């Protein structure tokens, strides 16, 4: 489906490409195969991200990466890519709003769930390759709000920083107040506990 | 990782150094040599700098800003505008012109910063190149007053004549390819 859409959206195929024209245009790779080149990259990139956030043609797991310096757009539909969900920031305002959390709060008898949040475009799944092209905020309120200017172009926000820890490390209370090797040791000792 | 900046040198210490000494490895990871100066050279920093220059390997590639291979049929023609003056001065009383002049020209520009840092002399470099390749290379050097340090190199005039009636059609590397090989060898192994 992605290849069909790309053909629709003014992507010249490698076979029909004049060799001279490649130099000034971005190369579009899908699953590691150079499908063709696109003369205007940013419009295509925005359209692809809109489609993924609406879940129309591009599935949520599909990751689009644009390397601006190297003039390459890479789209990976491959399996095995590790992804984490992140909140989406438009302008400097989080897309998640009070109406969404009100619907989620009454999750019973409203049939509003994480899938609805993904479909609404509030959250998105981002793999590491796409993480390289993403400006993230650790905490929304602190970093998004205007201060002494550090970054005014945040594109995504972390849901909560404590989610970086795994299953065994999550049982540690106040992990940030411990030495790191000690957290590593507790992760191993907790597997051997009795219960 | 946890040495100090006081050493100001790469030093292998700890378990790897113990293994190097125990196994008596032919090649240490960081071979080093501590040189103690004899007399006034130890007292004065400038004399120590002289000894340093004597002890540190320097090649033409270190002091060469850029190299260009030109084709100039006539040395008097001076295809490069800049070298007109000193080529004309040298050919006012030309040397080795009687044998011939090789048309292919190797033009080497030497960075003044590196040249003065190592305290090398243009005449010194010319003498070293002349000794290394014998008479097969003819070198023209600018005066130090010139803003750009230029060294002009041509194939041997006797070799250009070939000094042989048969002349052999082998034509090994012609002259341009031979000049490129000469440039690479000079840059890598000049040992000025």
């Amino acid at each position: 489906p992605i290849l069909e859409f790309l053909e629709e959206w003014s992507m010249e195929n490698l076979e029909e490409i004049s060799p001279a024209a490649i130099a000034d245009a971005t190369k579009i790779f899908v699953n590691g195969c150079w499908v063709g080149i696109h003369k205007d990259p940013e419009q295509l990139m925005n359209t692809l991200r809109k489609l993924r956030r609406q879940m129309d043609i591009i599935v949520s797991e599909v990751s689009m990466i644009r390397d601006i310096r190297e003039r390459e757009i890479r789209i990976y539909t491959d399996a095995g890519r590790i992804c984490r969900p992140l909140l989406i920031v438009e302008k400097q305002k989080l897309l998640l709003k009070k109406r969404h959390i009100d619907q989620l709060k009454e999750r019973e008898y409203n049939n509003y769930s994480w899938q609805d949040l993904v479909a609404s475009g509030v959250v998105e799944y981002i793999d590491t390759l796409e993480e390289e092209t993403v400006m993230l905020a650790m905490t929304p309120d602190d970093l998004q709000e205007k201060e002494v200017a550090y970054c005014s172009t945040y594109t995504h926000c972390e849901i909560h920083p404590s989610m970086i820890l795994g299953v065994c490390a999550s049982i540690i209370p106040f992990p940030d107040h411990n030495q790191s090797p000690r957290n590593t040791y507790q992760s191993a000792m907790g597997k051997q506990a009795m219960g | 990782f946890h040495y100090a900046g006081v050493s100001a040198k790469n030093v292998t210490l700890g378990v790897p150094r113990l293994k190097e000494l125990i196994n008596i490895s032919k090649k240490p990871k960081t071979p080093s040599l501590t040189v103690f100066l004899l007399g006034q050279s130890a007292r004065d920093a400038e004399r120590a700098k002289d000894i340093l220059c004597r002890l540190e390997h320097t090649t033409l590639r270190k002091v060469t800003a850029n190299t260009a291979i030109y084709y100039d049929p006539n040395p008097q023609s001076t295809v490069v505008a800049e070298d007109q003056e000193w080529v004309n001065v040298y050919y006012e009383m030309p040397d080795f012109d009687v044998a011939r002049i090789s048309p292919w020209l190797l033009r080497v520009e030497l960075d003044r910063k590196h040249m003065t840092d190592r305290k090398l002399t243009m005449e010194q470099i010319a003498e070293k190149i002349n000794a290394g390749f014998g008479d097969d290379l003819n070198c023209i050097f600018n005066d130090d007053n010139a803003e750009k340090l230029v060294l002009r190199i041509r194939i041997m005039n006797s070799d250009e004549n070939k000094m042989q009636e048969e002349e052999e059609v082998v034509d090994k590397m012609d002259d341009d390819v031979f000049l490129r090989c000469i440039e690479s060898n000079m840059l890598t192994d000049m040992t000025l």
Partner: peptide, 8 residues
């Protein structure tokens, strides 16, 4: 975890 000269 301390510094460059110390320990990690």
């Amino acid at each position: 975890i301390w510094g460059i000269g110390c320990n990690p």
